[PDB]
């Protein structure tokens, strides 16, 4: 099991780093503005309710 053409250990390691980087990014923008529902990624029903409360 000693190969020099594919490194599956690297492939799994790369995915974990991408997930941790994306989580760090989304936390900064929530902190920089102060809103949990920045986009429609988050609670779909929350933004609809908030719009009527804003009115």
């Amino acid at each position: 099991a000693i190969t020099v053409n594919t490194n599956v250990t690297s492939m799994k390691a790369q995915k974990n780093l991408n997930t941790s980087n994306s989580g760090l990014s989304t936390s900064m923008e929530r902190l920089s503005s102060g809103l949990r529902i920045n986009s429609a990624k988050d609670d779909a029903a929350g933004l609809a309710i908030s719009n009527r409360l804003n009115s």
Binding site: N21, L24, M28, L31, S32, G34
Partner: protein
């Protein structure tokens, strides 16, 4: 008499309420320091690329 009542009506439209304004001013001061720390720390995100051997 009518002069005093018109002064009432005119102030409600053009004059600020310091209770409202002071809270907003302090409200944004915190957001500024929060924004500056987030921006400074977000600027050094790409330094991760230096860890993976240049």
């Amino acid at each position: 008499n009518t002069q005093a009542n018109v002064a009432d009506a005119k102030s409600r439209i053009v004059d600020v309420d310091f209770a409202k304004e002071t809270s907003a001013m302090t409200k944004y001061q915190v957001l500024q320091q929060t924004g500056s720390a987030m921006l400074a720390q977000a600027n050094q995100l790409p330094q991760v690329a230096l860890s993976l051997l240049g």
